[PDB]
């Protein structure tokens, strides 16, 4: 028994556990599996030395995990983006530089340009704070991303790219998801460019040694306080001190509980009293994406000799993987290529043996890169989050049509003495590790204010720009921002 019990073992949890504890409070972290990273997990073994099988990239805009990571003595390193990149469409590879693949036909350049531009216009109107307050909230929330794309794109080229863009960020199908939501999501990281970018944004760097380290080291900083194998089963706010209880068959009491489960996973616990109605149902409507992350390892980074860094953007159904990044260690060390198997594909491809899938991955790469070499892997590693009981799937939680709108404002409303962290709770970079920190921190601070050691003021707190990962702003073009849409051009005539 203690002061405050935290229900998740992952980054948001620990971040929060620590904040509290750096603050004198007596904390305890109930964590359900033997490891402690979140959807964050770092394999270590001679063949690979280390690989993030969970989440790794981290960037310019993400001032907080950067910071936390530093305090625990960790270091960044940039991802390879020196050579050229590839957009392989209709069976051929086309190389290029810069964040964005070039388009040929004017009546298409116009389209694409409108597409993204429009995503951003549409977002500039959604408070991150609270998406459900947008002038057009409902209209956008009762529509599906596919609907939007269908309405928005006069060219197939664009319709597909956008699909992919989407398949790629969040984890599912243009048809699986609320427009209002997805629109929110992108903006809440600073829009298209920031998010899609390797170099001046989202996927610039990985952490030396693994993002796993983040939470392990906080565990180290915490005493015995972090209890592994402690699936929390049952929470009771009935009396005064709160009781939490473990599948284990032990009890803990405190005067507060932060929960860092991904929202759905709340169903995993039995509450008494019952949750208020909105929450109770909300927990039931907000699932997780599906993805298998895969890493194929070669003797050296053969791509570079062909003046490709290993970034492939790949169009089409026949392809197991649509996006690929270089995963070689910072030293020229373990040549590898990283790749995601998204959404429906993640479920189709699951049935194959690991082996069967490597063949597929390779063959693809050999073809896209154009090099027999890819046919000669030297080691493979993959994780399929789909199958994880205590995670539910990967990257994040998505919102289907009906929902942000109706159940949205509940996600982080406190229930008596339970407050709620978790990346899916953030406001910046939710969905990503940074999110997961802002969350926990904001949470815990909520509890502090409750206990009276701090004002409304200091629940929400600012993000001092890191010095190691400075951020430069986003640039537009008179042309880029006044060319007509395909319709405009039509009306112009």
Ligand X SMILES: *[C]C1=C([C])[C]=C2C(=[C]1)N([C][C]([O])[C]([O])[C]([O])[C]OP([O])(=O)OP([O])(=O)O[C][C]1O[C](N3[C]=NC4=C3N=[C]N=C4[N])[C]([O])[C]1[O])C1=NC(=O)[N]C(=O)C1=N2/[C]=[C]/[C]=[N+](\[C])[C][C]1[C][C][C]=[C][C]1
* List of residues contacting ligand X (CB under 6 A): 7-13, 30-33, 38-40, 54-58, 168-169, 195-196, 202-203, 231-232, 260-262, 265, 268-269, 291, 293, 323, 385, 390-391, 394-395, 422-423, 431-433, 435-436
Q: What's the burial of 292, exposed, middle or buried (CB within 10 Å: 0-12/13-18/19+)?
A: buried
- Of the ranges 97-105, 205-213, 278-286, 475-483, which one interacts with its own copies (CB under 8 A)? 278-286
Q: What is the chain's percent helix, strand, coil content, to nearest 5? A: 40, 20, 45
Q: Which does 387 bind (CB under 5 to 8 A by kind): its own copies, ligand X, none?
A: its own copies
- Interface positions, 308-347, toward its own copies (CB under 8 A): 344, 347
Cis omega (within 30 of 0) for bond into 133: no
7 makes contact, choosing from its own copies, ligand X, none, with CB < 5 to 8 Å by partner type, with ligand X
422 binds, among ligand X, its own copies, none (CB under 5 to 8 A by kind): ligand X
Give the CA distances from residue 354 to residues 9, 48, 322, 451, in Å, rounded to whole numbers and listed in that order.
Answer: 29, 17, 18, 52
Neighbours of 238 (CB within 10 A): 10
Find the largest Cα–Cα distance for the chain. Answer: 75
CB 214 within 8 A of CB 65: yes
Distances (CA, A) of 152 to 147, 206, 220: 8, 35, 51
Answer yes or no: are the C-beta atoms of 11 and 261 closer than 8 Å: no
Question: b/e per residue, 403-425, with b = 16+ CB within 10 A?
Answer: bbbebbebbbeebebbbbbbbbb
Minimal distance in Å, beta carbon 431 to ligand X? Answer: 6
When binding is defined by CB under 8 A, the residue of 120, 173, 216, 326 that contacts its own copies is 173
Q: Which of 100, 109, 271, 323 binds its own copies (CB under 8 A)?
A: 271
Q: How far is the CB of 275 from ligand X (least distance, A)?
A: 14
Q: Give the residue from 411, 355, 417 showing the smallest Cα distance to 380.
A: 355
Instruction: Give whichever of 137 and 386 is closer to ligand X, judged by the CB atom.
Output: 386
Q: What sign does the dihedral 244-249-252-253 (CA atoms) show?
A: positive
Nearer CB in complex with its own copies: 33/449: 33
Toward ligand X, which CB reaches closer, 148 or 166?
166
> Which one of ligand X, its own copies, none is in contact with 40 (Cβ closer than 5 to 8 A by kind)?
ligand X
Confirm or reject binding of residue 392 to its own copies (CB under 8 A).
Answer: yes
Identify which range of 10-18, 203-211, 226-234, 463-471 contacts its own copies by CB under 8 A.
226-234
Task: Tell me how far apart the alpha carbons of residues 244 and 479 are, in angstroms, rounded to a whole number.
Answer: 59
Interaction site with its own copies (CB under 8 A) = 142-144, 146-147, 172-173, 175-176, 231, 233-234, 247, 249, 264-265, 267-268, 270-271, 274-278, 280-281, 284-285, 287-288, 290, 344, 347, 350, 384, 386-389, 392-393, 400-403, 406
């Amino acid at each position: 028994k203690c002061d405050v019990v935290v229900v998740g073992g992952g980054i948001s949890g620990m971040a929060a556990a620590k904040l509290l504890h750096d603050s004198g409070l007596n904390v305890v972290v109930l964590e359900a599996r033997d490891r402690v990273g979140g959807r964050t997990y770092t394999l270590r073994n001679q063949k690979v030395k280390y690989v993030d099988l969970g989440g790794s990239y981290v960037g310019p805009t993400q001032n907080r995990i950067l910071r936390l990571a530093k305090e625990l003595g960790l270091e960044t390193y940039k991802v390879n983006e020196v050579e050229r990149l590839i957009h392989h469409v209709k069976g051929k590879s086309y190389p290029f530089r810069g964040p964005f693949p070039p388009v040929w036909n004017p009546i298409t350049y116009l389209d694409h340009n409108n597409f993204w531009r429009t995503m951003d216009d549409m977002g500039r109107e959604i408070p991150s704070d609270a998406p459900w307050k947008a002038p057009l909230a409902e209209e956008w929330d009762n529509m599906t991303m596919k609907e939007l794309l269908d309405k928005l794109c006069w060219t197939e080229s664009a319709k597909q790219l956008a699909t992919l863009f989407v398949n790629l960020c969040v984890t599912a199908e243009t048809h699986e998801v609320s427009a209002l939501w997805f629109l929110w999501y992108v903006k809440q990281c600073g829009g298209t460019t920031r998010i899609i970018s390797t170099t001046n944004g989202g996927q610039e760097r990985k952490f030396v040694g693994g993002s796993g380290q983040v939470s392990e080291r906080i565990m180290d900083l915490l005493g015995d306080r972090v209890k592994l194998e402690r699936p929390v089963i049952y929470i009771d706010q009935t009396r005064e001190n709160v009781l939490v209880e473990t599948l284990n068959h032990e009890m803990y009491e405190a005067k507060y509980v932060i929960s860092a489960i991904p929202p759905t996973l709340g169903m995993k616990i039995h509450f008494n009293p019952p949750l208020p109605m909105m929450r109770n149902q909300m927990i039931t409507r907000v699932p997780l994406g599906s993805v298998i992350k895969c890493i194929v390892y070669y003797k050296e980074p053969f791509w570079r000799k062909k003046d490709y860094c290993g970034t492939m953007i790949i169009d089409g159904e026949e392809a197991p993987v649509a996006y690929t990044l270089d995963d070689t260690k910072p030293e020229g060390n373990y040549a590898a290529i990283m790749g995601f198997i998204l959404a429906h594909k993640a479920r189709k491809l699951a049935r194959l043996t690991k082996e069967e899938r490597l063949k597929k991955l390779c063959e693809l790469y050999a073809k896209v890169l154009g090099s027999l070499e890819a046919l000669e892997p030297v080691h493979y590693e993959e994780k399929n989050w789909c199958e994880e009981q205590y995670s539910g799937g990967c990257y994040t939680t998505y919102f289907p049509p009906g929902i942000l709108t109706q159940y949205g404002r509940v996600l982080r409303q406190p229930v008596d003495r339970i407050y709620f962290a978790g990346t899916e709770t953030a406001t910046h970079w939710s969905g990503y590790m940074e999110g997961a920190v802002e969350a926990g921190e904001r949470a815990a601070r909520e509890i502090l204010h409750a206990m009276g050691k701090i004002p409304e003021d200091e629940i929400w707190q600012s993000e001092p720009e890191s010095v190691d990962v400075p951020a430069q702003p986003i640039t537009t073009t008179f042309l880029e921002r006044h060319l007509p849409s395909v319709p405009g051009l039509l009306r112009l005539i």
